[PDB]
Design a protein around this ligand. Structure first.
Ligand SMILES: [Mg+2]
Ligand SMILES: [Zn+2]
Ligand SMILES: [Zn+2]
Ligand SMILES: [Zn+2]
Lengths: 67, 115, 144, 48, 261, 192, 49, 56, 46, 421
RNA sequence: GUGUGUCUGGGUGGUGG
């Protein structure tokens, strides 16, 4: 539901790359070009940052059970 | 539930030996080296260095079970040349080669930063 | 108390199942004689029973979630009769068709076909590596 | 009734006399292990 | 009979990866060096967390697992640190551990990112990799208003053989004999195979002529660190660790030889 | 043990390249299919215009269906022969099959050349609708595509009509298994 | 000009399907059956009684 | 229903008010005509009527 | 002894004693949640 | 009770649907031009099964072209898309037309057992059984049908690099070998939620409390001090089998044993961390509690896995990263599956999914695997992959993990969607 | 200066091999 810290296959850190990827997409860069600009050359990491679903945002819509 | 502890692939239990020397009885000058808590990393280098030795006529390593953590190294040598000291020779030559490679890598990175 | 734990001859101790114990290994539906067979126990870490790939054929067993029923014979008489009657080697050949019920399968079969080809030539070190996975080897390296 | 107790497959004869539930038995999924012999079976620690 | 004379030729020394060539050595030695890169280079990663507040949607094991995967600058601390099992302290002592603290409360009506900046270290040399002085930080969890996360975590020395979080590398590109001279791999249609980057061949040729006397001699590496250690330090620590492994085995073998004769 | 440890060196795979053939083989497959459809069209024309003479021991529908089945069986045999003849020694499907480990030459033909004729209860796809198999077909269409003959292979991809017909055949297989289990169970219990 | 070419057909039909699923949804049969029962069938049973 | 998420599964019943003719063999009728007939807007229990002809 | 629950809606802390009606102190909600334990929570960061 | 589906309407061998409808539908969120307007425009209509008997149905608009004999020249209706004949679960399958139909049936059955985020408010619900994956991913190879099944925002598996090879014989008989190092990095980690419920009652009378051996009869020798003073485990408490999860005592009609202990215990084989405890009142006013127990499940040997094509398989051995084979770029497989599982099962959709996933991951794109798309075939994907420096058939020169000797046969390796059952 | 009671009997549905 949240971006994994490490790529499953090789172990490159991709926990810091989700927000930069979203910013590049908002900058009308093609997701292939966005992934290229983030240095993810191995297609394992491209899969990592490309197939991720940002479901933690949907969970944040619900109220906390205690404040 | 029955998952083994993660450390157990490299930590020796309370009491057993790291390596054991067993004589093979069906062939002379043949021994089975039982190294505990080890894998293909040491097995392949020791086997390859033994294969480089001309006084060795057999050298092989085997991991009996991937869920277990021991290797069996079988060495057969010329009648004068005992396989135990052949194994010692292999480890010594490997240490020397690794140290030489390390020092050369160190001077290589030194030169690369220097130009 | 340790006075209770003092064993004497004639007592019976219910020890846990150690290695080499004989068990009857059954898979439903129990169709033919080879559907339940005697097996020797080897202790292994994880939570699944483990089988050699050859016995998957007499059991008609796959590894896509198949479960299996183990039975531990309790008396030494029952253990001995399972050992003398129902062990896997003792029943390789089935009476229903007088042919072996179990054989070489899948990976081993394709690789042994690829292995026995006339063009397969093995280097010395490869021969050393393969020769030591032979439990019946006499230790004499053959002439190339 | 008594006839219902005796007649069924889950009844008394076929359900409790001919075949019955037994002690000293285990069940868990099976996985391959080419390193074992054909007569050997891997067993988990908890089951043993 | 005796050791080889392995020469080294380094082609790339970026701060994230090292590309180098080893000649005059065996295939087994090179592959074992690769294995030691992956699994037998000790680094420091979080392996003990104590959560005393977690109102986040991610449960405690989720947060702990994410924390363990965050890389820490392991340079020069791992040399002097000790394994936690090997240390005499009943707790996590500084000579065998590094304490990390995190306490993030989201009192704002906008979403709070619990980045790797919130992992506050008790030592300056070891810190999360992104904190070193451009590049974004590692997201532990997202917090809305009212949710907190308080935890005290310790980082201990460990190697990849126990857990993947202690792996210092991310992708070890090991390759030898690009032109297929040894024919260790057989192409049914060699023309439709892309040339390797280290290929010495021209565009006309598909693969090199076969050489029976040839053996694997030149090995091509590309060790890409995840930032925890410098890649050159990764290679040197790997060599030293493999050497010390062999030394320990030799010492034990000599002890058994003494005990036997 | 020995054979697996050598398989570490040799290795053994299966992939897309093993399910493909050169341009010549695919041209031959398409030509064989086209000739088969031409023969079926000619037999259909003969039956409609009554040049086709019924064979003894059966009716006119049985004669027509038997001839259509012969033509399509010949087409499947020729396409399978062409596909198998096109294989290389490095083909992994061929390796799995000739070793007898798993698969069959029929599986190779279905994957590479032609899936073949889909059958329901031993005959072609019935006219579930009024005189047609699907609403996409003309009434009284006895051609191959209309009655379940899957021209394409598993590599090229089944057309949706062929997908539905293949689903019907698979459903028949599943139902047969489901009833067979209970029937044989009772027979076995009585026998023991 | 007032026609869809083959190259444009795929995006057109998927737009049509997207519109359908945006409107009807996936469980429309159950909701519609229950709505009909509540709105009409209960009243019809009561009046018919 | 009592905290349990229940789902009603659609039941595939034979259509009503429509005459169907089936080849009910292995019986003393040859052809039969079934009409499961129910009246609209009250759903009184179906009064199926079969019309059949003898076999000879 | 001073058992604390949490309202599902108000997220308020309520001192509810044994065999008491389950009522919020503000909105009177019927559903209450327990606070996280105090003993010790430790996970090896795997 | 009549069943019907929408279909486009064909008149004079032309689609009544024109470019104007699509142009309006593109602005659907703006000018509220809905599917209802399309129905009212006379462009689509619902055709019953009985009506379907007498229609002349066109598979696709290019089937309407009169460049030849044209088969039929009186088409009355046209399918919107042939992929719409598939149900919910069959829509998940990529390239279902490249598979044997029993495999598609098995995947339809097994898609209902795959793990994932079953609902967005799962932390609120107190279902008796619940499985949630740590890191679900939308499939790289995606059919357009599950754009509307909510699959790309509630996915049920992970895109994983599988290599179809016979590595060590532990993947035989439909079994898999998976990367232990990947599993440590969160690959297919999931959480199992178990909920218990209990009600107190008065007729005798029973209450929630922390029982004591001096006033309760016949309890078990389990730690009752895990409970709070009200007889309920607090959240964040590790709990094992035969541990009291709810402390409940019933009074007896008629010392040491004035009450009988009727406490509910955790299931004997189950362990976990208590994560959510709720106390409320039932319909008739008695106290009623629900306790959710959280158990993190690491993928281990024996856990069942399945592709999207009926390629089920229990996990065999797990090898660490160094033991697993690797490409020239250091890309180990996440899973290794046996090649023998393919030929008898005909799951060519598995291979095409791997090829398309490789192309998509290298391209930075999401591949289309809508079943009856003529625009996509194996050759175009192969040419695409060859443009990215890989072998066009998805094969690679793998290296042995134990020895570093490059394997003689080039292994087929690529990303494909996998599911944990 | 100790220690056994573990809600049965039916029905319905789903599932695995
Ligand atoms: Mg079965
Ligand atoms: Zn990666
Ligand atoms: Zn210490
Ligand atoms: Zn409230």
């Amino acid at each position: 539901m949240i971006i994994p810290v490490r790529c499953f296959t090789c172990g490159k850190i991709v926990g810091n790359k989700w927000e930069a990827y979203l910013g590049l997409l908002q900058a009308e860069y093609t997701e292939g070009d966005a992934l290229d600009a983030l240095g993810l050359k191995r297609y394992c990491c491209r899969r990592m940052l490309l197939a991720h679903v940002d479901l933690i945002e949907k969970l944040l819509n619900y109220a906390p059970l205690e404040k | 539930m029955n998952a083994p502890p993660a450390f157990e692939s490299f930590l020796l239990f309370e009491g057993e030996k790291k390596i054991t020397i067993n004589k093979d009885t069906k062939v002379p000058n043949a021994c089975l080296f039982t190294i505990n808590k080890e894998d293909h990393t040491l097995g392949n280098i020791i086997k390859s260095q033994l294969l480089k030795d001309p006084q060795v006529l057999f050298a092989g390593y085997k991991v009996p079970h991937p869920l277990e953590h021991k290797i069996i190294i079988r060495v057969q040598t010329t009648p004068d040349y005992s396989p135990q000291e052949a194994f010692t020779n292999a480890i010594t030559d490997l240490i020397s080669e690794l140290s030489l490679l390390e020092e050369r890598f160190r001077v290589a990175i030194k030169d690369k930063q220097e130009g | 108390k340790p006075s209770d734990l003092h064993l004497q001859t004639g007592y019976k101790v219910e020890r846990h199942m150690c290695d080499g114990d004989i068990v009857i290994f059954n898979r439903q539906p129990t169709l033919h004689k080879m559907s339940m067979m005697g097996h020797r126990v080897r202790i292994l870490p994880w939570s699944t029973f483990r089988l050699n790939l050859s016995v998957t054929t007499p059991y008609n067993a796959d590894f896509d979630g198949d479960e299996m029923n183990l039975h531990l014979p309790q008396s030494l008489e029952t253990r001995a009769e399972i050992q003398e009657l129902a062990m896997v080697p003792r029943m390789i050949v089935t009476p229903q068709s007088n042919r072996p019920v179990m054989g070489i399968v899948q990976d081993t079969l394709t690789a042994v076909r690829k292995f026995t080809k006339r063009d397969v030539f093995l280097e010395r070190g490869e021969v050393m590596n393969l020769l030591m996975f032979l439990s019946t080897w006499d230790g004499k390296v053959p002439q190339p | 009734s008594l006839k219902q107790r005796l007649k069924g497959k889950e009844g008394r004869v076929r359900g409790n006399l001919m075949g019955k539930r037994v002690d000293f038995s285990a069940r868990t999924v099976i996985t391959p292990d080419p390193n074992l012999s054909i007569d050997q079976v891997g067993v988990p620690r908890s089951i043993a | 009979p005796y050791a080889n004379q392995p020469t080294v030729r380094i082609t790339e020394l970026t701060d994230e990866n090292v590309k180098f060539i080893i000649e005059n050595t065996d295939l087994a030695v090179a592959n074992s060096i690769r294995r030691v890169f992956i699994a037998e280079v000790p680094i420091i990663a979080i392996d003990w967390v104590q959560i005393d507040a977690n109102s986040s949607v991610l449960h405690d094991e989720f947060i702990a697992h994410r924390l363990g995967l965050i890389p820490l600058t392991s340079d020069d601390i791992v040399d002097k640190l000790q394994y936690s099992r090997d240390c005499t302290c009943e707790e996590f002592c500084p000579e065998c551990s590094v304490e990390f603290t995190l306490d993030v409360r989201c009192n704002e009506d906008q979403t709070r990112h619990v980045t790797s900046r919130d992992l506050i270290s008790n030592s300056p040399r070891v810190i999360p990799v992104t904190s070193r002085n451009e590049q974004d930080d590692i997201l532990i969890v997202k917090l809305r208003k009212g949710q907190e996360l308080r935890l005290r975590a310790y980082a201990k020395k460990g190697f990849g053989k126990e857990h993947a979080k202690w792996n210092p590398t991310a992708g070890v590109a090991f390759e030898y004999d690009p032109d297929n001279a040894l024919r260790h791999t057989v192409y049914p249609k060699p023309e439709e195979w892309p040339k390797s980057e280290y290929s010495e061949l021209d565009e006309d040729e598909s693969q090199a002529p076969y050489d029976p006397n040839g053996k694997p001699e030149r090995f091509y590496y590309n060790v890409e660190s995840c930032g925890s250690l410098r890649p050159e330090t990764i290679v040197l620590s790997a060599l030293s660790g493999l050497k010390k492994k062999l030394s320990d085995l030799q010492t034990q073998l000599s002890h058994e030889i003494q005990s036997d004769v | 043990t020995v054979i697996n440890n050598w398989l570490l060196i040799e290795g053994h795979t299966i992939g897309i390249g093993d399910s493909i053939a050169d341009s010549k083989t695919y041209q031959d497959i398409q030509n064989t299919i086209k000739k088969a459809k031409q023969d079926v069209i000619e037999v259909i024309e003969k039956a409609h215009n009554n040049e086709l003479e019924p064979t003894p021991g059966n009716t006119l529908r049985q004669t027509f269906e038997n001839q259509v089945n012969r033509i399509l069986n010949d087409a499947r045999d020729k396409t399978g022969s062409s596909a198998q003849k096109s294989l290389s020694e490095y083909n992994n499907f061929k390796s799995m099959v000739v070793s007898g480990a798993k698969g069959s030459k029929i599986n190779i033909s279905q994957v590479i050349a032609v899936v073949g004729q889909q059958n329901v209860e031993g005959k072609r796809i019935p006219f579930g609708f009024k005189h047609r198999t699907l609403p996409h077909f003309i009434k009284d269409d006895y051609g191959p595509e209309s009655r379940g003959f899957v021209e394409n292979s598993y590599l090229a991809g089944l057309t949706p009509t062929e997908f539905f017909f293949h689903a019907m055949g698979g459903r028949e297989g599943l139902i047969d298994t489901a009833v067979k289990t209970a029937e044989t169970g009772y027979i076995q219990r009585r026998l023991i | 000009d007032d026609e869809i070419t083959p190259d444009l057909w795929q995006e057109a039909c998927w737009i049509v399907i997207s519109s359908y699923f945006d409107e009807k949804g996936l469980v429309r049969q159950q909701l519609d059956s229950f709505d009909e029962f509540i709105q009409m069938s209960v009243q019809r049973i009561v009046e018919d009684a | 229903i009592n905290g349990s998420e229940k789902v009603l599964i659609a039941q595939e019943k034979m259509a009503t008010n429509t005459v169907y003719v089936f080849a009910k063999k292995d019986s003393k009728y040859a052809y039969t005509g079934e009409c499961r007939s129910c009246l609209e807007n009250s759903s009184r229990p179906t009064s199926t009527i079969w019309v059949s002809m003898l076999a000879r | 002894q001073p058992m604390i629950y949490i309202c599902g809606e108000c997220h308020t802390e309520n001192e509810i004693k044994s065999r008491d009606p389950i009522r919020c102190r503000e909105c009177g909600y019927r559903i209450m949640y327990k606070k996280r334990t105090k003993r010790l929570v430790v996970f090896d960061a795997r | 009770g009549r069943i019907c589906r929408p279909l486009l309407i064909v008149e004079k061998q032309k689609l009544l649907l024109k470019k104007r409808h699509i142009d309006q539908l593109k602005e659907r969120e703006y000018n509220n031009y809905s599917w209802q307007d399309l129905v009212a425009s006379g462009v689509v209509e619902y055709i019953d099964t009985l009506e379907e008997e007498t229609v002349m149905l066109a598979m696709t608009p290019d089937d309407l072209q009169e460049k030849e004999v044209a088969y039929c020249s009186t088409y009355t209706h046209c399918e919107i898309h042939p992929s719409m004949i598939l149900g919910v679960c069959a829509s998940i399958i990529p390239f279902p037309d490249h598979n044997q139909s029993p495999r598609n049936t098995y995947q339809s059955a097994m898609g209902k057992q795959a793990m994932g985020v079953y609902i967005t408010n799962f932390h609120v619900r107190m279902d008796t059984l619940a499985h949630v994956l740590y890191y679900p991913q939308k499939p790289l190879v995606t059919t357009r049908s599950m754009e509307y099944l909510r699959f790309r925002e509630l996915p049920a598996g992970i895109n994983s690099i599988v290599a179809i090879a016979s590595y060590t014989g532990y993947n035989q008989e439909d079994s898999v070998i998976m990367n232990r190092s990947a599993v440590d990095r969160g690959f297919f980690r999931s959480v199992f939620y178990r909920s218990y419920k209990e009600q107190e009652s008065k007729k005798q009378e029973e209450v929630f409390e922390k029982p004591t051996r001096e006033t309760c009869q016949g309890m078990r020798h389990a730690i009752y001090d895990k409970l709070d003073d009200d007889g309920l485990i607090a959240p964040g408490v590790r709990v094992s089998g035969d541990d009291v999860i709810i402390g409940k005592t019933v009074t007896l009609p008629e010392r040491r044993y004035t009450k009988r202990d009727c406490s509910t215990f955790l299931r004997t084989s189950e362990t976990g961390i208590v994560d959510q405890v709720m106390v409320t009142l039932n319909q008739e006013g008695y106290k009623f509690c629900k306790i959710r127990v959280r158990s993190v499940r690491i993928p281990q040997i024996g856990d069942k896995f399945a592709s999207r094509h009926g390629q089920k398989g229990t996990c065999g051995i797990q090898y660490r990263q160094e033991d697993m084979p690797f490409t020239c770029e250091g890309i180990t497989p996440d899973i290794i599956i046996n090649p023998h599982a393919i030929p008898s099962r005909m799951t060519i959709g598995h291979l095409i999914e791997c090829l398309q996933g490789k192309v998509s991951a290298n391209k930075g794109e999401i591949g289309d695997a809508t079943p009856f798309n003529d625009a996509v075939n194996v050759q175009k994907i192969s040419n695409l992959l060859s443009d990215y420096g890989y072998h066009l058939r998805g094969n690679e020169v793998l290296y042995n993990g134990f020895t570093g000797r490059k394997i003689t046969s080039q292994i087929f390796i690529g990303p494909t969607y996998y599911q944990r059952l």
